[PDB]
Design a protein around this ligand. Structure first.
Ligand SMILES: Nc1nc2c(ncn2[C@@H]2O[C@H](COP(=O)(O)OP(=O)(O)OP(O)(O)=S)[C@@H](O)[C@H]2O)c(=O)[nH]1
Ligand SMILES: CC(=O)/N=c1/[nH]c(C)c(-c2ccc(Cl)c(S(=O)(=O)NCCO)c2)s1
Lengths: 470, 173
């Protein structure tokens, strides 16, 4: 009875559920948990869909069969849910296939919408310049409006909705590469529930067309004002980056880890700052990312401004005697400490200013999570960053160290939640981040669970000293 | 002290359906998720009163695995009652109830009282055998029927107490 006691206690949450499901070899437990999933809140379980489905694919049939009923149940009440299942099932096997086919058996509008977006991106390979690509993109996106509005949505959106319109003149291609990703803006009308409503009616259309470097709210204004649907209160603007030829599965894994660390740090009371950005896996090949707006790469901030990072801070926020500056500095210091910790724990590599974004309030945001964990430069603290923090002798810089210690102590207290996420994903995985022999073992070592706090203080110093040598 | 009757009852069914926990629930009010396959046979006893008479029931928990099915059938001998159990959440286990009753018309008294038991009623959302279909089959073949959860303990007492009572008044005249 002691086990069943626990399962019926307050301590039982979806995490514990998944853990037992993953570990227990008892079919009675598997079935018991399979049934208890229905009792949990959708949102809580949703976060773990990749884990559940990975287990389903790569684990013993008993484990799959305990999971399936719940999945099918969710699939029947939400086509969004159906979609993500079908997309994930396919992506994570290259067992899955039988159920995927059954779920796809309706969704054609969405799947064709996505196919076309993917198809567009693949065509731009023949245009060797960014600017030429952008021209063809814009033209080709306008053709999508001929099919809108439809039973189509962006899974990356916080809410239920219908897609009505694509402001094609606003779309842009992000590099000159062969399989370049491209950023688009999408218009939508919010729902309270998708599955039982609308598909709104077309409004035929006709300055708003011109595209330039401007803040997010100024861009919404311009697009809205030009849009047929812009008058409605129901109307909102979304954005996605479309990656037609890039795997996003590590990117998804990192997201979960970032999201967990973020909760961990909110629950303990450490004001580190980070920004998980949503991921949508579409195939092993392809997916989408929801971008952070009002942010641009550090590198390009220095190429268009011709300034030093600090000089740019001073230009964009004010003199160091201003509130706006001191606030931005704080966001800098808090976002740096956050991301340092993420980089260390996940062993994030390939770190350079093309991969670090700066938002309009002063937070930095790290971005290219190829090269994490076992996959094989590390996170650096350049003097340019130290300058923005007010220097080595600075109080804000000491505070950066303080935060790092605090966030580490916090992380250790909730380590299992983090490790869980990675370890279940490793299962049948041929992802480069699991190439090594000791991925999870090394991950745990990096939490330094044996250490006394005095020891951790030292480790933080060593870490920081290390971050500066280069 | 003294019983008026000693009723020998067997629990049979596919491996995994919950026989051993029906028994542990019924005789010591205990249940467990973690399980050890029943090797051959297990014994437990409990006394009840029906229509004023103390009846001691001797229950033999048989084991559904086939490795042991030569030696379980030994104990079918002279048993007055049999709980034939299936798992509500695993359809195959219900499918085999027909072969489990032929198993009584080869190694056991031809005039025995049977109750069909759908166990694990607590797994609502995993249900693979509808209550109506089962109870239909139950009386087409002259069997009494009930659904239990050894886990939450629903109907476990009732199940036993029903079959023992049913038995106790076949005997009279
Ligand atoms: N949820 C739930 N699980 C149950 C119930 N009854 C039994 N189980 C679980 O089923 C599994 C197997 O049950 P068990 O007690 O071995 O049945 P059995 O028929 O004796 O199996 P065997 O002895 O022929 S090998 C165990 O994990 C047990 O915890 C029930 O009513 N509800
Ligand atoms: C203006 C701007 O850069 N907004 C963005 N917001 C986000 C989350 C961006 C992002 C995040 C991750 C990745 Cl992986 C990409 S990317 O388009 O695929 N860049 C590849 C190498 O940079 C872009 S880009």
């Amino acid at each position: 009875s002691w086990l069943l006691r626990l399962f019926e206690s307050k301590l039982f949450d979806i995490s514990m559920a998944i853990s037992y499901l993953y570990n227990s070899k008892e079919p009675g437990v598997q079935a018991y948990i399979g049934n208890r999933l229905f009792c949990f809140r959708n949102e809580d379980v949703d976060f773990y869909l990749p884990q559940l489905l990975n287990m389903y694919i790569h684990m013993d049939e008993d484990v799959g069969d305990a999971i399936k009923p719940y999945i099918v149940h969710r699939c029947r009440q939400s086509i969004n849910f159906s979609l993500q299942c079908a997309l994930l099932l396919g992506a994570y096997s290259s067992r899955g296939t039988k159920l995927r086919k059954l779920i796809l058996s309706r969704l054609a509008p969405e799947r064709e919408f996505i196919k076309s977006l993917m198809a567009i991106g693949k065509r731009l390979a023949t245009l060797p310049t960014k600017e030429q690509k952008t021209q063809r993109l814009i033209s080709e996106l306008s053709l999508l409006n001929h099919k809108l509005p439809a039973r189509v949505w962006l899974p990356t959106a916080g809410f239920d909705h219908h897609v009505v319109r694509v402001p094609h003149t606003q779309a842009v291609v992000l590099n000159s590469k062969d399989k370049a990703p491209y950023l688009i803006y999408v218009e939508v009308l919010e729902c309270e529930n998708f599955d039982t409503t609308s598909v709104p009616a077309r409004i035929p259309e006709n300055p708003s067309a011109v595209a330039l470097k401007e803040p997010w709210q100024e861009k919404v204004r311009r697009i809205r004002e030009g849009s047929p649907y812009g008058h409605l209160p129901n109307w909102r603007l979304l954005s996605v980056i479309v990656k037609c030829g890039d795997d996003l599965r590590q990117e998804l894994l990192a997201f979960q880890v970032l999201k967990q660390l973020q909760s961990i740090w909110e629950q303990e009371r450490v004001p580190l700052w980070i920004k998980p950005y949503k991921i949508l896996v579409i195939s092993a090949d392809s997916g989408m990312i929801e971008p952070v707006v009002n942010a641009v790469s550090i590198h390009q901030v220095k190429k268009q401004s011709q300034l030093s990072l600090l000089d740019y801070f001073l230009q964009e926020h004010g003199s160091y005697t201003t509130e706006a500056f001191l606030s931005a500095q704080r966001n800098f210091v808090q976002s740096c400490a956050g991301y340092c910790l993420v980089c260390y724990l996940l062993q994030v590599k390939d770190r350079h200013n093309g991969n670090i974004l700066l938002d309009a309030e002063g937070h930095i945001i790290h971005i290219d999570f190829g090269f994490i964990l076992s996959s094989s430069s590390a996170f650096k603290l350049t003097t340019e960053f130290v300058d923005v923090m007010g220097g080595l002798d600075g109080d804000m810089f000491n505070y950066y160290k303080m935060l790092m210690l605090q966030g580490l102590i916090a992380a250790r207290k909730h380590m299992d939640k983090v490790v869980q996420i990675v370890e279940i994903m490793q299962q049948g995985s041929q992802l480069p981040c699991f190439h090594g022999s000791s991925t999870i073992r090394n991950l745990k070592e990096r939490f330094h669970m044996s250490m006394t706090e005095e020891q951790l203080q030292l480790l933080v110093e060593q870490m920081v000293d290390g971050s500066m040598r280069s | 002290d003294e019983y008026d009757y000693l009723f020998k009852v067997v629990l049979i069914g596919d491996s995994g359906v919950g026989k051993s926990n029906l028994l542990s629930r019924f005789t010591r009010n205990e249940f467990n998720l973690e399980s050890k396959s029943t090797i051959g046979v297990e014994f437990a006893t409990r006394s009840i009163q029906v229509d004023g008479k103390t009846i001691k029931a001797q229950i033999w928990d048989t084991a559904g695995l086939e490795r042991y099915r030569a030696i379980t059938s030994a104990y079918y001998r002279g048993a007055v009652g049999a709980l034939l159990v299936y798992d509500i959440a695993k359809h195959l286990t219900y499918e085999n109830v027909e072969r489990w009753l032929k198993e009584l018309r080869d190694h056991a008294d031809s005039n025995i009282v049977i109750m069909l038991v759908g166990n694990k009623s607590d797994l609502r959302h995993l249900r693979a055998v509808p209550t109506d279909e089962a109870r239909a089959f139950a009386e087409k073949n002259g069997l009494s029927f009930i659904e239990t959860s050894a886990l939450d303990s629903t109907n476990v007492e009732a199940a036993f107490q029903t079959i023992l009572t049913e038995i106790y008044r076949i005997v009279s005249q």
